[PDB]
Short mmCIF file of C-alpha atoms and ligand atoms in Angstrom, two decimals:
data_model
loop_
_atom_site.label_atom_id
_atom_site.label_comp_id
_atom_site.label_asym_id
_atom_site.label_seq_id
_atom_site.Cartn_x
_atom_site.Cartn_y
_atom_site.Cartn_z
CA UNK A 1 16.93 9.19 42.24
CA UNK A 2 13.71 10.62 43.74
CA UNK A 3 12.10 13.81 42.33
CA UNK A 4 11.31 15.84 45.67
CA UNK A 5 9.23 17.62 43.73
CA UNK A 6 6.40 15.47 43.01
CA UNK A 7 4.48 16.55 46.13
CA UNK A 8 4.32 19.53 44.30
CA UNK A 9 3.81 19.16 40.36
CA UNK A 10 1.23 17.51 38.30
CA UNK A 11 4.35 15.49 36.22
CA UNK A 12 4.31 15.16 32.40
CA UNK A 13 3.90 11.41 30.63
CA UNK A 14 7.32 11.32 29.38
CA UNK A 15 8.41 10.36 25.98
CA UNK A 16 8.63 6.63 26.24
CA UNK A 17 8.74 3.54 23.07
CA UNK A 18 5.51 1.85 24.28
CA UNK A 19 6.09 -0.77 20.62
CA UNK A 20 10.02 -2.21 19.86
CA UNK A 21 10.39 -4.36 17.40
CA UNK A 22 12.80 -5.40 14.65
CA UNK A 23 11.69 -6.99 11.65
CA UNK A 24 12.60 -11.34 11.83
CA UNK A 25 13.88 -10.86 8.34
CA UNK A 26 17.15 -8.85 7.49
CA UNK A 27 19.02 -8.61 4.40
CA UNK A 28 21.82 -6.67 2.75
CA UNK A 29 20.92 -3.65 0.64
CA UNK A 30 17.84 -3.73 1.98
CA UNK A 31 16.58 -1.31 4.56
CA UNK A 32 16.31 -2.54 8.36
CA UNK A 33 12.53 -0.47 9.43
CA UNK A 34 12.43 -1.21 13.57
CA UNK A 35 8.85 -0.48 14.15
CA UNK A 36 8.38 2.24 16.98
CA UNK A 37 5.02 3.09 18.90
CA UNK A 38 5.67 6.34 20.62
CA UNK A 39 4.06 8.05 23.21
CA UNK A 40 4.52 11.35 24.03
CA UNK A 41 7.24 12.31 21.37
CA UNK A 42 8.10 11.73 18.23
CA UNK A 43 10.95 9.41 16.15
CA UNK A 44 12.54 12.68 14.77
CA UNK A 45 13.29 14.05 18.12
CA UNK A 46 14.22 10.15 19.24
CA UNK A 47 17.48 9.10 19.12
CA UNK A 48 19.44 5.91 17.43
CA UNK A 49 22.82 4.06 17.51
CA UNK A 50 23.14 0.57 15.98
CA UNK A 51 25.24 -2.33 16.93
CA UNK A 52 26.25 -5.22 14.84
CA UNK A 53 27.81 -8.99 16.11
CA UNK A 54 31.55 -8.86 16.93
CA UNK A 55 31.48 -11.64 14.15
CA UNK A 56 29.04 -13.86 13.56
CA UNK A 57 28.26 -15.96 16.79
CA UNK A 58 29.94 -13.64 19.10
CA UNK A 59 26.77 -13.15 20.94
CA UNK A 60 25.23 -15.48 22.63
CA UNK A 61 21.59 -15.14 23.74
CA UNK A 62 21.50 -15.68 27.90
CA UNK A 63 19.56 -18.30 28.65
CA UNK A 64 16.42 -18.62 30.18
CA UNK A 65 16.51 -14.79 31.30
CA UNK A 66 13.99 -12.63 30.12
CA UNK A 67 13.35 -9.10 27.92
CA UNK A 68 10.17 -8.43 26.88
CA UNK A 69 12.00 -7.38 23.81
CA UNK A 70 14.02 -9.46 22.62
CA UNK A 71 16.96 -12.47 23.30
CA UNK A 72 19.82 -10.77 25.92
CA UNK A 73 23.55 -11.06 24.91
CA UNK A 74 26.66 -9.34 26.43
CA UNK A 75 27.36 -5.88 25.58
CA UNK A 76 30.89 -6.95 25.00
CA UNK A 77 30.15 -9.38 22.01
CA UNK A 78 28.62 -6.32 20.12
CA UNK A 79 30.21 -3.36 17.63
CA UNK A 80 29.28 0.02 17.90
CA UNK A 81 28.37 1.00 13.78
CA UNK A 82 28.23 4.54 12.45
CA UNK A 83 24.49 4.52 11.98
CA UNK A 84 22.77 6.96 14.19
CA UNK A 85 19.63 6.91 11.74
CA UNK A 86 16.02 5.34 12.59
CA UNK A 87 16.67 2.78 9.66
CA UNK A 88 20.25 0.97 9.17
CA UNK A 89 20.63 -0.79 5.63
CA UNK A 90 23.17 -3.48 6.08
CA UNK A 91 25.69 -4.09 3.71
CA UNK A 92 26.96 -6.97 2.76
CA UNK A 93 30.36 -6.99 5.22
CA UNK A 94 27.50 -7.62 7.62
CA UNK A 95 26.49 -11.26 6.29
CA UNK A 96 25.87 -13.70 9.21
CA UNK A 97 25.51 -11.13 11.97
CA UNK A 98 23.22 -10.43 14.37
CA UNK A 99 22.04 -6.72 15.00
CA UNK A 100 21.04 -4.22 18.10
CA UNK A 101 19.25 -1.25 18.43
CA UNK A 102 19.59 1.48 21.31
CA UNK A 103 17.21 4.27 21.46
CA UNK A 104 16.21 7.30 23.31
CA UNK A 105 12.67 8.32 23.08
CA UNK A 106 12.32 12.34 22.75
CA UNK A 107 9.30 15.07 21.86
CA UNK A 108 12.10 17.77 21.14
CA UNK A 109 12.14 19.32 24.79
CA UNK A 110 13.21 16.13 26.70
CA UNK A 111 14.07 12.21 26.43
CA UNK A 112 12.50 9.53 27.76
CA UNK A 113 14.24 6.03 29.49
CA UNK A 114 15.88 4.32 26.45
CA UNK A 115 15.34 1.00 25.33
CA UNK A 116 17.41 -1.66 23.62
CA UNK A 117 16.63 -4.87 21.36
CA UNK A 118 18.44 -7.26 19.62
CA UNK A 119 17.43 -8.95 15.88
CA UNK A 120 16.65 -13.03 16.02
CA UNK A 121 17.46 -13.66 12.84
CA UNK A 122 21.53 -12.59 11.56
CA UNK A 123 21.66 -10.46 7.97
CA UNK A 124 21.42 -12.27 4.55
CA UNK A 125 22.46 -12.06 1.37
CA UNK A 126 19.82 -9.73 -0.53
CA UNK A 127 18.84 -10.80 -4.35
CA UNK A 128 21.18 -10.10 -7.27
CA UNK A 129 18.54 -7.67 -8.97
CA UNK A 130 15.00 -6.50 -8.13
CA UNK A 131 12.90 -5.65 -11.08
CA UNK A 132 12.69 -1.81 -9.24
CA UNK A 133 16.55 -1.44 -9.19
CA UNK A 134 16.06 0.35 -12.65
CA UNK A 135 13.02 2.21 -12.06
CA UNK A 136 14.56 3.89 -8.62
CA UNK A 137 17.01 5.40 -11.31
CA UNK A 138 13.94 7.83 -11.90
CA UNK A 139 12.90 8.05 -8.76
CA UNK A 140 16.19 9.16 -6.66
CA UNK A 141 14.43 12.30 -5.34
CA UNK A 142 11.27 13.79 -3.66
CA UNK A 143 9.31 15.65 -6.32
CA UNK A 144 9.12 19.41 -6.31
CA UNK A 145 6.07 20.79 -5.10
CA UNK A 146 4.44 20.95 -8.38
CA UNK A 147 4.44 17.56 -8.65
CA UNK A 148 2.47 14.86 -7.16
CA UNK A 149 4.09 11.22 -7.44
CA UNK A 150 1.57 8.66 -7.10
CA UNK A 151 1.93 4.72 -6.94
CA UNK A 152 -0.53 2.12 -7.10
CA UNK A 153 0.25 -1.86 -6.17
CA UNK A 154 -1.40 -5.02 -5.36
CA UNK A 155 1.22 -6.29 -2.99
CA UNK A 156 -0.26 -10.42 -2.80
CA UNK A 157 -1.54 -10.83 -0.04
CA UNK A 158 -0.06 -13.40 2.49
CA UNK A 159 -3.43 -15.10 3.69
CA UNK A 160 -3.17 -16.02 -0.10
CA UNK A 161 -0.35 -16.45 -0.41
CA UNK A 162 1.62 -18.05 2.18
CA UNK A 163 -0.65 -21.92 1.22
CA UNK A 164 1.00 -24.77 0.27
CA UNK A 165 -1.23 -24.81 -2.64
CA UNK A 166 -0.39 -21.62 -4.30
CA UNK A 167 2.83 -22.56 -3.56
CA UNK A 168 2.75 -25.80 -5.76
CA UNK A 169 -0.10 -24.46 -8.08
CA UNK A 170 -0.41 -20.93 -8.99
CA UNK A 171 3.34 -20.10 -8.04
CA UNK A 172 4.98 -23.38 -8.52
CA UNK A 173 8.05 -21.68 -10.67
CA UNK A 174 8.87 -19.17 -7.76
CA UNK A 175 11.32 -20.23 -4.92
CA UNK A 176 9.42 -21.02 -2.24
CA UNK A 177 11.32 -18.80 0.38
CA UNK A 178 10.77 -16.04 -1.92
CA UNK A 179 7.43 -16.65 -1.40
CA UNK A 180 7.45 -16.13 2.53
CA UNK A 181 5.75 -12.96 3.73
CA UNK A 182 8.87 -11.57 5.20
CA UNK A 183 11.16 -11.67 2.39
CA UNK A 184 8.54 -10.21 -0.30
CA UNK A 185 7.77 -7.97 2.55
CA UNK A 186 11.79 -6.48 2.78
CA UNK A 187 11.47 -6.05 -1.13
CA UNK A 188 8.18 -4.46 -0.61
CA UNK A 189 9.63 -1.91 1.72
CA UNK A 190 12.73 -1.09 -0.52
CA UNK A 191 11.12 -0.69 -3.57
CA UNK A 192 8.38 1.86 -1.99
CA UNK A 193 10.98 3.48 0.08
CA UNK A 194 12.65 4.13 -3.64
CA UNK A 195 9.84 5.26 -5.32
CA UNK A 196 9.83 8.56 -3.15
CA UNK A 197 6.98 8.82 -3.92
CA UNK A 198 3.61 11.77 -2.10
CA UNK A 199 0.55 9.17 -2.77
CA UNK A 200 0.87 5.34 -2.87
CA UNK A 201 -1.86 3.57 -2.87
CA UNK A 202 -1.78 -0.47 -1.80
CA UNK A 203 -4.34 -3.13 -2.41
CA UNK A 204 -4.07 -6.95 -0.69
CA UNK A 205 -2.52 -5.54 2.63
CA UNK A 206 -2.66 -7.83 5.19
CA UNK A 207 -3.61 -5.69 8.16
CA UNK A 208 -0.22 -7.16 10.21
CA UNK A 209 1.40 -6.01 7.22
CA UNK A 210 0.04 -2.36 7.18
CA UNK A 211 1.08 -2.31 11.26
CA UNK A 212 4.20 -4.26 10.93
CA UNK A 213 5.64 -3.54 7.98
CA UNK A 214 4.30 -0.47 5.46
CA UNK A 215 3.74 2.05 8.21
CA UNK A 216 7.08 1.44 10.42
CA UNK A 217 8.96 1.68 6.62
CA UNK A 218 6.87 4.79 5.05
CA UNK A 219 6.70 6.81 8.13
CA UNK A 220 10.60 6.35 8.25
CA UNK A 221 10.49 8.40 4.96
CA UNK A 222 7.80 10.50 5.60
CA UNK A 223 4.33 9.20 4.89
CA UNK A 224 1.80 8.40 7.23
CA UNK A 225 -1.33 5.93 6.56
CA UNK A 226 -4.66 4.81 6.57
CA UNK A 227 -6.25 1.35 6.60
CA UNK A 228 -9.57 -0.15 5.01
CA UNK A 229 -10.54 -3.76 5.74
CA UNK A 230 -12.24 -5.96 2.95
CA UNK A 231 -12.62 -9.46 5.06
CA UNK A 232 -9.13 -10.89 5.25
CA UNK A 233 -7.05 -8.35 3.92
CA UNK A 234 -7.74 -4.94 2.50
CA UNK A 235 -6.55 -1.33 1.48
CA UNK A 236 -3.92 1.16 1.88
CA UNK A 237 -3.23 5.12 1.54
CA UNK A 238 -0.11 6.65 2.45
CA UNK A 239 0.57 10.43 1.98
CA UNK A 240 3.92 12.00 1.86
CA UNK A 241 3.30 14.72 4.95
CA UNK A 242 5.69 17.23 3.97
CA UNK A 243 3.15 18.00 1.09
CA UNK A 244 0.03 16.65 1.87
CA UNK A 245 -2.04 16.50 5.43
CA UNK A 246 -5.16 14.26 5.54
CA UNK A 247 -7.98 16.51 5.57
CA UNK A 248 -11.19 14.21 5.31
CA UNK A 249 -12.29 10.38 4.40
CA UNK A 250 -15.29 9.18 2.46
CA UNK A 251 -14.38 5.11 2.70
CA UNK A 252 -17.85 3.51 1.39
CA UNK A 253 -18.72 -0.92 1.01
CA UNK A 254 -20.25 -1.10 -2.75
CA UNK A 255 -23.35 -3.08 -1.27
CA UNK A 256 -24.04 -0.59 1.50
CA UNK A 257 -23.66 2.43 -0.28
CA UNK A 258 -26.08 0.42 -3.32
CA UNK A 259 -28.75 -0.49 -1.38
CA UNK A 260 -29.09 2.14 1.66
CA UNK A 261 -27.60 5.78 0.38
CA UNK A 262 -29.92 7.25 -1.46
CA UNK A 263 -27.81 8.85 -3.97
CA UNK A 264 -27.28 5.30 -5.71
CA UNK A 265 -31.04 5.11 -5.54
CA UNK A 266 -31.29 5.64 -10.19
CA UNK A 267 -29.01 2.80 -10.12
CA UNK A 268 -30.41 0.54 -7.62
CA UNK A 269 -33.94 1.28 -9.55
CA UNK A 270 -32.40 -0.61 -12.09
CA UNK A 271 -30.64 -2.85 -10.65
CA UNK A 272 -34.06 -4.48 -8.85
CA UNK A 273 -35.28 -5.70 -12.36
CA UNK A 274 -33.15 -7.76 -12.20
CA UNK A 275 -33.10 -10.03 -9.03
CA UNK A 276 -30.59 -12.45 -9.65
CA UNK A 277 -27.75 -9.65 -10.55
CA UNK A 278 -29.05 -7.71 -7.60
CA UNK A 279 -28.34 -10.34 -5.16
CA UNK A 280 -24.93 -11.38 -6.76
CA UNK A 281 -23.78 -7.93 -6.20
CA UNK A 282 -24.80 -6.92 -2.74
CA UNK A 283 -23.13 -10.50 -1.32
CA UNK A 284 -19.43 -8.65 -1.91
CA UNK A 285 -18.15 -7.40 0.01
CA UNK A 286 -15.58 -4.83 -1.56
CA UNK A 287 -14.86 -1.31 -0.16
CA UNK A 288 -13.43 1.98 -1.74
CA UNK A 289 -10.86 4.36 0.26
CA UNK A 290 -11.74 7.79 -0.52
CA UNK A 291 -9.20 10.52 1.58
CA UNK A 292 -9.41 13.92 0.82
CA UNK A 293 -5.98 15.55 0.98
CA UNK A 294 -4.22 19.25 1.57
CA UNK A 295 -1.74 20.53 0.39
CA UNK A 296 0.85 22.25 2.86
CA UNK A 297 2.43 24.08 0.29
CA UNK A 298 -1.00 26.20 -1.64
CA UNK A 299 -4.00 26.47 0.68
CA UNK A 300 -5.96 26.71 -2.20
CA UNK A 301 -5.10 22.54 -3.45
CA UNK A 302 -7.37 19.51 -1.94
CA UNK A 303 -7.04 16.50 -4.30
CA UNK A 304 -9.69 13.66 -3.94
CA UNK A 305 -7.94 10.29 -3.46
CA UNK A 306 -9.62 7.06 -4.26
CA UNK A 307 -8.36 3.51 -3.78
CA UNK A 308 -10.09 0.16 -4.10
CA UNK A 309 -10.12 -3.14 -5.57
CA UNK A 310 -13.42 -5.01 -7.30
CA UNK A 311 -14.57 -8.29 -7.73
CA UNK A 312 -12.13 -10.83 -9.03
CA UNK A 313 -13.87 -13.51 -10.58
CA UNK A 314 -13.46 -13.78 -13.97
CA UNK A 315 -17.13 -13.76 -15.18
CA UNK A 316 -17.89 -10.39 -12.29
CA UNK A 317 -17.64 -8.24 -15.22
CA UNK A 318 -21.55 -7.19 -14.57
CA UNK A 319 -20.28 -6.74 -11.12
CA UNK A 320 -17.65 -4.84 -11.86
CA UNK A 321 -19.34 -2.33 -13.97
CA UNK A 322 -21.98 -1.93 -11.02
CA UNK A 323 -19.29 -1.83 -8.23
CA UNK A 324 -17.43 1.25 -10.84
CA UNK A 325 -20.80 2.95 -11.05
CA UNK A 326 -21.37 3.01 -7.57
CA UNK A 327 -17.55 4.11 -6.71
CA UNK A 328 -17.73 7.34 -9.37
CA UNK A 329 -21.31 8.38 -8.21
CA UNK A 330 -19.49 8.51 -4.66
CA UNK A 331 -16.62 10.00 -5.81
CA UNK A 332 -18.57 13.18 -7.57
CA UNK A 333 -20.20 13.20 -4.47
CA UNK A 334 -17.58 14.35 -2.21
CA UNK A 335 -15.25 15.84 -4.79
CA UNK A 336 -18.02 18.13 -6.73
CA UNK A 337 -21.32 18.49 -3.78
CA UNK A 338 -18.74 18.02 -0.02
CA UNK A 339 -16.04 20.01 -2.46
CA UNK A 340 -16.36 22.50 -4.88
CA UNK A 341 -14.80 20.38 -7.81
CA UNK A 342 -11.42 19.21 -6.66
CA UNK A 343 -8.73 16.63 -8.84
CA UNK A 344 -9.50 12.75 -8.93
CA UNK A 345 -7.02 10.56 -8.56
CA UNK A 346 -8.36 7.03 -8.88
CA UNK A 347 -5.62 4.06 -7.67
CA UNK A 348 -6.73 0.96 -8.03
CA UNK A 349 -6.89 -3.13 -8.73
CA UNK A 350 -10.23 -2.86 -11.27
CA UNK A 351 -9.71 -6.57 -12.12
CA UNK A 352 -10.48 -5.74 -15.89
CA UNK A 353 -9.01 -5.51 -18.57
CA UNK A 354 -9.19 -2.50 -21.54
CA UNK A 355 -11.56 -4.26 -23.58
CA UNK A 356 -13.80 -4.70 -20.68
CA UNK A 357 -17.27 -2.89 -20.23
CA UNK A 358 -16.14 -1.64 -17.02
CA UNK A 359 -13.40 -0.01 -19.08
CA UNK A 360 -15.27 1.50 -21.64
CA UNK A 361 -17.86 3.12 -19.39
CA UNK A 362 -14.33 4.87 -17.37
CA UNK A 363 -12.93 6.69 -20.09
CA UNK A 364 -16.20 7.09 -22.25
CA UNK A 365 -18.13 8.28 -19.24
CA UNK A 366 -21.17 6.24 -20.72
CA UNK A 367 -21.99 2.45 -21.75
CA UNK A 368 -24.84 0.89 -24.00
CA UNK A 369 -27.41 -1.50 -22.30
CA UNK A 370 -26.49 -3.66 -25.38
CA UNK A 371 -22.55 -4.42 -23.90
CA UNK A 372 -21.79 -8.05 -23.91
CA UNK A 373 -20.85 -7.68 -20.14
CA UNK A 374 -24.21 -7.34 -18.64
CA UNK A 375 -24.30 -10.97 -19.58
CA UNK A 376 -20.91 -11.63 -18.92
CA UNK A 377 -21.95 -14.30 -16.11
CA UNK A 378 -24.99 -15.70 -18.46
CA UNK A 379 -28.85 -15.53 -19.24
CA UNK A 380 -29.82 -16.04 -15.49
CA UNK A 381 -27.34 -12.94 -13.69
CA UNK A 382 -28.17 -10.83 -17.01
CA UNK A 383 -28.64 -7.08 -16.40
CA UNK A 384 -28.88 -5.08 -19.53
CA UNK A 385 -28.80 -1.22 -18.38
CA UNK A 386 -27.29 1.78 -19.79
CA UNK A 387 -24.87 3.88 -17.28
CA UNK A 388 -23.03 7.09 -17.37
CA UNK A 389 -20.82 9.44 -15.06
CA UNK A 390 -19.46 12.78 -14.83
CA UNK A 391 -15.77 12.54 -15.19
CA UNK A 392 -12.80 12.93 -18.43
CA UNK A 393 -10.63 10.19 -17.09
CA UNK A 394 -7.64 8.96 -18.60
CA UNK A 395 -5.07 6.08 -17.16
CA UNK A 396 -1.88 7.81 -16.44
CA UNK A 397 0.26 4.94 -17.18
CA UNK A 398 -1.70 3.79 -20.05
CA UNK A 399 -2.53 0.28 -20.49
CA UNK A 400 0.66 -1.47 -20.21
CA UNK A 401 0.88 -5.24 -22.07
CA UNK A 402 0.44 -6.33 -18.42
CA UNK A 403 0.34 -5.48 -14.84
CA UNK A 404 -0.77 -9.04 -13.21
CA UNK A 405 1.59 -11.52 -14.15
CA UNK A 406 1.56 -15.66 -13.20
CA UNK A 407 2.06 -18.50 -15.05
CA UNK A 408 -1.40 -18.88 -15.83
CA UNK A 409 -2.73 -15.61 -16.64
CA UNK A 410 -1.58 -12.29 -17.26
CA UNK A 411 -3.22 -8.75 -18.04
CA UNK A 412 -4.06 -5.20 -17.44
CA UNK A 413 -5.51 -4.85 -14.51
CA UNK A 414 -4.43 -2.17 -12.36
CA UNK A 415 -4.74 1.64 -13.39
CA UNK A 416 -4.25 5.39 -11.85
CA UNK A 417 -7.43 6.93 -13.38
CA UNK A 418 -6.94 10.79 -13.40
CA UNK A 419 -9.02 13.67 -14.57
CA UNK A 420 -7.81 15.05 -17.37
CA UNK A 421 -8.91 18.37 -16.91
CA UNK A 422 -7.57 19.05 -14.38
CA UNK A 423 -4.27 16.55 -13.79
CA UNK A 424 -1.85 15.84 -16.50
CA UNK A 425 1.29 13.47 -16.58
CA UNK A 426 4.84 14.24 -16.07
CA UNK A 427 6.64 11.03 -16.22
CA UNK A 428 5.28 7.31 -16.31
CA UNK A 429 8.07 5.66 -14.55
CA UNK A 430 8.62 2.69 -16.91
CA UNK A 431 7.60 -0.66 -16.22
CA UNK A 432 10.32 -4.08 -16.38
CA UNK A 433 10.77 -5.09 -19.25
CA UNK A 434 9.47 -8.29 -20.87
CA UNK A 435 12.28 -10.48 -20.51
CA UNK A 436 12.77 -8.81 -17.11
CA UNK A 437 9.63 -10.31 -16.04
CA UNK A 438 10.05 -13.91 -16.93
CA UNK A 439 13.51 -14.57 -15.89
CA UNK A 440 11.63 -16.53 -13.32
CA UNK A 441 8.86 -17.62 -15.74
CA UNK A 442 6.49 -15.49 -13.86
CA UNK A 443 5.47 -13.12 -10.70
CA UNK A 444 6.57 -13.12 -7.63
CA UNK A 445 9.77 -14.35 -8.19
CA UNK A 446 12.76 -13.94 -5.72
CA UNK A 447 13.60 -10.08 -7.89
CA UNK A 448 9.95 -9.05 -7.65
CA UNK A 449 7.40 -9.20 -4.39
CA UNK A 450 4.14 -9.52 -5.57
CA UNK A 451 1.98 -10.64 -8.76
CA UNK A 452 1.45 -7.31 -9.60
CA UNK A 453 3.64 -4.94 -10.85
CA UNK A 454 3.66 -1.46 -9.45
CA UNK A 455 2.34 1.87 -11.08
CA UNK A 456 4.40 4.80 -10.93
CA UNK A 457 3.86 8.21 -11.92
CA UNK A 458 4.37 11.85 -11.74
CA UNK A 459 1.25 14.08 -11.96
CA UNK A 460 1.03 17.25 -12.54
CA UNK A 461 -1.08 20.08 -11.77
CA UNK A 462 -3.12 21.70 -14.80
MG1 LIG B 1 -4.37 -11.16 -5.97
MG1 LIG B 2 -7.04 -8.89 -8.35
#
């Protein structure tokens, strides 16, 4: 009815959903993340109930009438389930139904007017086995505060993906629906959901993926997230917010920071002798994430967090040691001159391997100007230079046999760089194993979501 007191009363925005959406693909086992934009309260205060089909075509859509939502059925053809929780996981007694979600937006004073939506698509069968079913059996809990739990993972991104030629040429053993954004996507969100993890940070996200898909799943668990575009696709951050609160960011573009912050000016000195390099490497167009985060649980811990993924091609490896160069300059920057010294963590896809000269200079801190990779693109793009940094950094996970693996290449290419003074490893949370891997010939594969294979690890505090 009316308020007769509005004559009266400057009136609150009430809580209200102001995004609904369920995700197009649902399977069994796997969790169901409805993506909520809130205003003016908050999904813990919110509330949930979830409906499934009577049994399986009991509800048919009315035609022709609109939501803005979703399709409309009658209330009659649906079951009220036990699930009062933000995410439902079907199981598989739910095969070939459709699902519904009610909810109640709230702030923790009040609700809002609820809304309700139903799912297009009806629940499927979920894989046999995910290469992560084994390595949740480490990760079952939240880590005590001592610990810090830290993921990296190039998730393959669907703009390259999702062709018709990587489907026939660089994937061509890997079902093609397991292929399809949406499916690698509900694996993607179940294994991270599993991991438990405080820090995970993502390379290749599409940025409908980090909307869509990573932040309604993480936030459902706890973390919140930042973005950083490259051109099509870019990176992630996600922090676990019951021990960690975003207290600054630092997010640099290699070429930028090269040629027009003066504290890569040494560098770019001697990068200018060489013309030919110098242009190669200020045309890409790769970033670095840098987000400085606090611990809620010792006022006295910041760790620096740094994310990023260099140049791919194959013969970059001049570029990559110049894009690593400019990214640990930056990095001593803000954690030793903006901070007094804090922890490194370093997440990334470096695109090279341990015998690399990118390598080398990370955990030697120095490289000759004799290395074979300031040639590593020939005579013409040569540029011969010596380098060091500052930092004792060690890969927490070691160097696996691989972390990139398709059916034309494979290596080491991902790493969590930590400093070693001041971080030390609990647990490397083991990688599949071999045969694991190529029960499908190669990655992705319809038990594993990506080409990559994620990094997981506890850290510890020194
Ligand atoms: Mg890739
Ligand atoms: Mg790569």
């Amino acid at each position: 009815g009316i308020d007769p007191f509005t004559k009266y009363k400057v009136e609150r925005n009430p809580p209200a959903f102001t995004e609904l959406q369920l995700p197009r693909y649902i399977m069994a086992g796997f969790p169901v993340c409805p993506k909520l934009s809130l205003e003016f309260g908050d999904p813990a205060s919110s509330l949930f109930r979830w409906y499934k089909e009577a049994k399986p075509g009991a509800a048919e859509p009315e035609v022709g009438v609109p939501s803005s939502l979703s399709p409309s059925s009658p209330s009659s053809s649906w079951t009220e389930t036990d699930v009062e929780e933000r995410v439902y996981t079907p199981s598989n007694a739910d095969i070939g139904l459709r699902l519904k979600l009610h909810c109640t937006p709230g702030d923790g004073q009040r609700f809002g007017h609820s809304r309700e939506l139903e799912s297009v698509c009806v629940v499927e069968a979920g894989p046999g086995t995910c290469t992560f079913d084994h390595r949740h059996l480490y990760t079952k809990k939240v880590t005590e505060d001592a610990l810090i739990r830290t993921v990296s993972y190039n998730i393959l991104a669907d703009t390259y993906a999702q062709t018709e030629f990587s489907r026939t040429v660089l994937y061509p053993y890997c079902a093609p629906y397991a292929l399809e954004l949406d499916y690698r996507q509900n694996l993607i969100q179940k294994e991270l959901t599993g991991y438990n993890a405080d820090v995970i940070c993502l390379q290749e996200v599409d940025r409908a993926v980090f909307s869509d898909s990573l932040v309604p799943a993480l936030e459902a668990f706890g973390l919140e997230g930042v973005f950083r575009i490259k051109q099509h696709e870019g990176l992630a951050t996600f922090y676990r917010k019951s021990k960690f609160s975003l207290l600054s960011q630092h997010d640099i573009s290699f070429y930028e920071a090269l040629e027009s912050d003066p504290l890569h000016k040494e560098l770019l000195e001697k990068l200018v002798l060489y013309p030919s390099a110098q242009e190669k490497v200020l045309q890409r167009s790769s970033v670095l994430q840098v987000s400085v985060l606090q611990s809620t649980k010792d006022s006295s811990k910041r760790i620096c967090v740094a994310n990023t993924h260099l140049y791919w091609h194959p013969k970059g490896g001049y570029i990559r040691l110049i894009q690593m160069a400019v990214a640990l300059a930056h990095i001593r920057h803000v954690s030793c001159d903006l901070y007094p010294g804090i922890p490194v963590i370093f997440c990334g896809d470096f695109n090279s391997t341990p015998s690399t000269g990118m390598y080398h200079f990370v955990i030697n801190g120095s490289i000759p100007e004799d290395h074979e990779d300031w040639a590593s693109n020939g005579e013409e793009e040569r540029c011969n230079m010596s380098l060091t940094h500052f930092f004792k950094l060690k890969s927490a996970c070691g160097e696996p046999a691989y972390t990139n693996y398709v059916g034309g290449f494979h290596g080491c290419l991902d790493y969590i760089f930590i400093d070693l003074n001041a971080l030390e490893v609990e647990q490397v949370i083991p990688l599949p194993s071999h045969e694991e891997v190529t029960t499908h010939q190669a990655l992705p594969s319809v038990s594993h979501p990506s080409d990559h294979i994620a990094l997981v690890c506890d850290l510890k505090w020194k």
